[PDB]
Every structure is written in structure tokens, then in C-alpha cells.
Amino acid sequence: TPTTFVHLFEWNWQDVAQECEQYLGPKGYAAVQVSPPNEHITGSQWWTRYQPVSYELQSRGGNRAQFIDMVNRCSAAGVDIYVDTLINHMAAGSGTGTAGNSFGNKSFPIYSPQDFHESCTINNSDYGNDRYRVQNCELVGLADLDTASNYVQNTIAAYINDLQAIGVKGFRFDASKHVAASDIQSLMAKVNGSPVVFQEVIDQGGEAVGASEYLSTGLVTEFKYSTELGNTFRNGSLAWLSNFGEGWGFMPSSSAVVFVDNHDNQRGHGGAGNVITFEDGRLYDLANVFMLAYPYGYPQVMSSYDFHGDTDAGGPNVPVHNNGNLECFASNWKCEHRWSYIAGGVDFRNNTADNWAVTNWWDNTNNQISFGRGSSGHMAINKEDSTLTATVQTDMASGQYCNVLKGELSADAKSCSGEVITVNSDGTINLNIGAWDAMAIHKNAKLN
Ligand SMILES: [Ca+2]
């Protein structure tokens, strides 16, 4: 059952189309969030993608034809496409777009100086006590579109309706905090049907504009999850997560889009150092295993590239698929969605989606937790410096199960590629997990 989606940051349409057929489809990913496909400014920095010139599908990821080929090829594989949409602004200053268009002085090929809000600057303090300035002034200098204008709302909605016709099935509304929820509701009245849409709102609390103001127009990104999960795994006790979710002040599970990190907060935008990324290796594995196993939110697995510190640097200068050679796990693309632990976690979630309850919770009161998803699956994480050799109780049928985190079940279901977990006649399991490791089993990965 589809339950997870991945974000292939800066991946071009070619790589995404291939990745769909070769891995994403077969593994179980529901869909893919792609980088803005519309025309943007020229430059190698990743953030150039967030400075639109027009809405013609000519970006750094490829052209219209290529984009279309990508949507189609993924659909056949069983993978939807989510398009990161810019609804709050347009490029800044003056220049040229990736499709050859010119712009300058709030004058684009499809917008005039009158289609924008009068120029003013958004200040750090404005977020706390001035929703007006937050949604009407310029964010980092980006021309702020007049989202209340019928003309503006029509051109954006036309862009969205085109991508739907092409087959896009979801949308990410970027910088939704900088756009009045009222304007978003108007926009959606012009959008055909009801495509999956989630809004990027960064609300850690104490802000003029609350995340809750958008629960009505679609899902919302819950940044608390990220910083809290990271902070717990780094400086707290995993035993605290027993009631993670609404109990910690988080928005409703069925409204939240959670994740361990994203392209922003992994660069210091929306999260401090406590956030966990691919650079933390095994820590990232464990953290991801928790997220995918825990029945809260719609998980967004991250797929990034090593930027060697430079937070402005763009993606690698080599495709993920280099003449039959996969450029992953090294100094270019990290392809975390392919890491055994993370993919294994995706598998767990997919086969336990028929029991969104956390059962038989157990913990050593500190950094060894364990719980199940009813008789559909069970997991355990050991973050201590000694082996977890405790006997836990499960609701799973006795037998031999594959630890889907370290391997998978064979075709004939008569073997596992990784280690085998045993559930005794009484439904218990005599754990045997080394320091900083984990296990996870489900009903669709049973032997013989
Ligand atoms: Ca705005």
C-alpha cells in the first residue's frame, strides 16, 4: 500500500523517469516530488529554481517534452508526480530565464508591475507580530505577487490545470506562509478536481501566521516533527517518543507531511544543527526507521546530494545514471531513498498500513524502544552501547521472519537475503540487536 513519497532534489527528468522504472516503482514509493519545472533565472545555485520568470516548462531539469515523458513513464510504473509550485512570488531584480525570456523591474512576460504588491521588506520581527508584512512584503527581495488579483489567480490556476492535464497528480505550494489562506482558497476554487496538495508552512510556534490556518486547503508541512525527532535522537531518550505526534503539540496526523529533513532545513533554513541528515550516517538510518515505522503523518523521504558544506552549491555535474553506471552513495548523489534501512522502512510502512495503531510499546526507559503495528508488524531500535537482548511481546503469528531492514524475502518466500527474526509460539521475540542497529518485520515477509 502506498504510504511514502520521496523528494529527488535537483534530479533532472531523465534520471527521475529511469529511477521510477528501475527502483521507485518496484520498491513501493507512492510518488515523487520534483524540483520546480517552470522557467527560472540562470545560475548554478540550487535556489535559482525558486525564482520564476514564466510558467513554460523549460528548466534546469529539462524541457517540456522531457518533462512529459517523465510523468508518463513514472505513471506506468505506479508512481505519481508532485510539482513544487511557486505561488507567492516571481524572480528578483532583472535578468534572463532558462527559456530565453527577459524580465526586469517587476516586468515579466506574464506579469506587470501592477500584478505585484507594493515593495516592502519582510523583517525577522515581522513574523512574530505583523501577518500583514509577512504576506504582503517581499521575502528576501522576491517580487511578491498579488495573490488576491483575479488575473494572478487565473494564471497560476491555469499553470496547475495544465500540469494536471499532462498527468501531474500533486502539488507543493512553496512559501505558503507568505500567502493569505483566503487567497489560497480562492486559487483552489479555480483548480480542476481535487489533486493532492500540501503546503510548505514553517511554524515552530509563536508566529503571527499559524500553520493551522492552512489545514483547510490541503496538507501542511510539520517542521516540528523534524526538529523534535532530531533533538530527541541527539540529546534525549527515545523512550520519550512513546506519545510522539499530537501529544507533543503537533498538528493532526492526517494533515501533516513529516520528514527527517528537507532541502531547506538541511542547510540551516528552518532547523538548527539538531536536525539529522545523511552526514550522520547510522543516526540517519535509525531516525528514518522510526519515522517510517511510526503511524504519524505522510512521510517524505529525502534524497539529496553531497554539497561539501557550500549551502549555495547546486547539484552534481553528472547524471544519476551515467551510461549504465549509478552515481550513488559517494561524493555526488547520496540516494538515501536507496539505503537499505530507509527502503526497508518504506517496506514496513506499506505492509502495516492496515493497522495505524502502536501496540505493545516497550522501552528500557532510555534509548532502547520497541513497538508493533498489531499483528501486521513489529520493530525495535537499539541506541545504547550494549546489545538489546530483551524479550518483547508481539501480536504476530509465530514463525521465521526476514529483518526487512537488512534484506528481503525471496520470490518463493523460502529465504531471506539478510538476518532472520523468530517469533516464538507465545508471540514474543528474544531480541539480539547490537549497538546502534534496528530490526523490523511484517506479515508479508514470512518464510516458507
Ligand atoms: Ca506574499
Side-chain angles (χ1 to χ4, degrees), residues 1-117 119-448:
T1 308
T3 67
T4 315
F5 78 103
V6 62
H7 172 35
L8 299 178
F9 189 35
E10 282 296 280
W11 280 41
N12 66 66
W13 315 149
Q14 226 74 297
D15 281 340
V16 178
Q18 265 172 284
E19 195 66 5
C20 279
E21 306 169 332
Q22 301 186 187
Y23 191 86
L24 303 179
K27 295 286 113 173
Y29 287 88
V32 191
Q33 195 207 297
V34 303
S35 287
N38 68 294
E39 188 191 5
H40 57 84
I41 57 170
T42 53
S44 70
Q45 304 94 316
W46 66 269
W47 48 248
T48 61
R49 291 301 266 290
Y50 299 84
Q51 289 198 50
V53 175
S54 86
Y55 296 131
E56 307 177 11
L57 303 176
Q58 192 94 297
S59 60
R60 176 155 65 201
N63 63 41
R64 188 173 167 72
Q66 298 189 284
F67 182 78
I68 304 184
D69 176 61
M70 171 193 83
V71 179
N72 293 325
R73 291 174 60 194
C74 291
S75 296
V79 190
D80 298 330
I81 304 292
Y82 294 165
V83 167
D84 191 351
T85 319
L86 287 298
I87 62 166
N88 183 67
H89 54 276
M90 289 297 275
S94 188
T96 295
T98 64
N101 287 306
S102 300
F103 72 90
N105 291 175
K106 292 176 160 183
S107 187
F108 297 81
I110 57 182
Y111 291 132
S112 54
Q114 294 67 220
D115 294 313
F116 299 94
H117 284 144
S119 286
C120 50
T121 297
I122 295 179
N123 284 92
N124 179 52
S125 52
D126 288 354
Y127 293 103
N129 56 188
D130 206 315
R131 67 154 58 227
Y132 176 86
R133 287 202 130 223
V134 170
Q135 315 180 321
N136 289 298
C137 298
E138 304 173 302
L139 169 61
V140 196
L142 287 304
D144 204 63
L145 281 171
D146 181 6
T147 47
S149 165
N150 193 57
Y151 172 79
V152 181
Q153 306 190 341
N154 290 320
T155 74
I156 291 186
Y159 171 51
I160 302 176
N161 290 321
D162 266 7
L163 299 177
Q164 291 206 80
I166 283 178
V168 177
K169 287 193 171 61
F171 300 88
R172 177 185 123 93
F173 286 169
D174 172 270
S176 280
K177 182 167 63 178
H178 297 73
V179 184
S182 311
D183 296 339
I184 293 182
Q185 302 194 56
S186 311
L187 183 66
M188 298 300 282
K190 300 177 183 292
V191 179
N192 298 311
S194 55
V196 177
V197 32
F198 58 108
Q199 296 138 301
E200 176 206 53
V201 180
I202 303 183
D203 177 10
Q204 300 273 183
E207 293 204 50
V209 179
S212 58
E213 313 177 11
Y214 301 83
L215 297 171
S216 154
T217 36
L219 299 174
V220 175
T221 61
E222 177 51 278
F223 278 81
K224 289 183 176 169
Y225 189 97
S226 180
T227 52
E228 285 301 317
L229 198 254
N231 191 69
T232 311
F233 266 82
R234 277 177 192 296
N235 318 99
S237 294
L238 301 181
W240 297 347
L241 313 170
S242 63
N243 74 327
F244 210 46
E246 286 97 329
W248 282 43
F250 294 177
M251 53 175 60
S253 176
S254 65
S255 288
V257 166
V258 304
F259 47 81
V260 177
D261 59 332
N262 84 325
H263 71 294
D264 283 304
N265 80 348
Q266 88 174 191
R267 292 182 170 68
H269 300 299
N274 44 33
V275 176
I276 307 170
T277 74
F278 63 86
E279 297 178 12
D280 292 82
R282 186 48 123 241
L283 229 212
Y284 197 67
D285 283 313
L286 294 178
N288 275 285
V289 172
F290 177 79
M291 167 183 78
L292 303 162
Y294 203 86
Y296 177 82
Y298 183 26
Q300 174 223 265
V301 170
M302 184 60 206
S303 199
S304 54
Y305 59 75
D306 188 346
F307 53 96
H308 316 303
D310 187 350
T311 54
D312 285 305
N317 294 303
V318 53
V320 172
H321 297 293
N322 218 11
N323 290 105
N325 166 58
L326 196 66
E327 306 278 353
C328 288
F329 329 116
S331 277
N332 300 302
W333 316 88
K334 310 302 308 187
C335 319
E336 306 100 303
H337 61 288
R338 283 197 179 224
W339 289 15
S340 89
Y341 283 66
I342 299 169
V346 167
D347 193 47
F348 183 75
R349 202 179 188 70
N350 293 188
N351 294 89
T352 59
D354 55 8
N355 205 310
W356 294 86
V358 169
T359 63
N360 288 298
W361 174 279
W362 173 89
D363 63 62
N364 75 328
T365 76
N366 183 219
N367 295 313
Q368 301 188 318
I369 63 165
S370 180
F371 70 84
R373 299 293 295 290
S375 52
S376 288
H378 206 83
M379 70 82 83
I381 301 182
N382 174 19
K383 237 208 64 183
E384 301 282 7
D385 291 313
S386 22
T387 318
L388 168 60
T389 62
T391 300
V392 296
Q393 176 70 63
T394 92
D395 283 342
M396 302 202 74
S398 57
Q400 245 90 306
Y401 291 91
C402 300
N403 180 351
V404 306
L405 255 29
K406 294 173 177 185
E408 59 194 22
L409 187 55
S410 63
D412 53 302
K414 280 161 182 168
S415 60
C416 302
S417 66
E419 77 186 20
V420 174
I421 306 305
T422 306
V423 293
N424 309 104
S425 61
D426 64 346
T428 69
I429 301 180
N430 311 296
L431 296 181
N432 184 355
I433 302 165
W436 288 57
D437 205 346
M439 84 87 184
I441 63 174
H442 63 77
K443 63 182 169 193
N444 290 146
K446 203 176 184 295
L447 281 185
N448 68 290

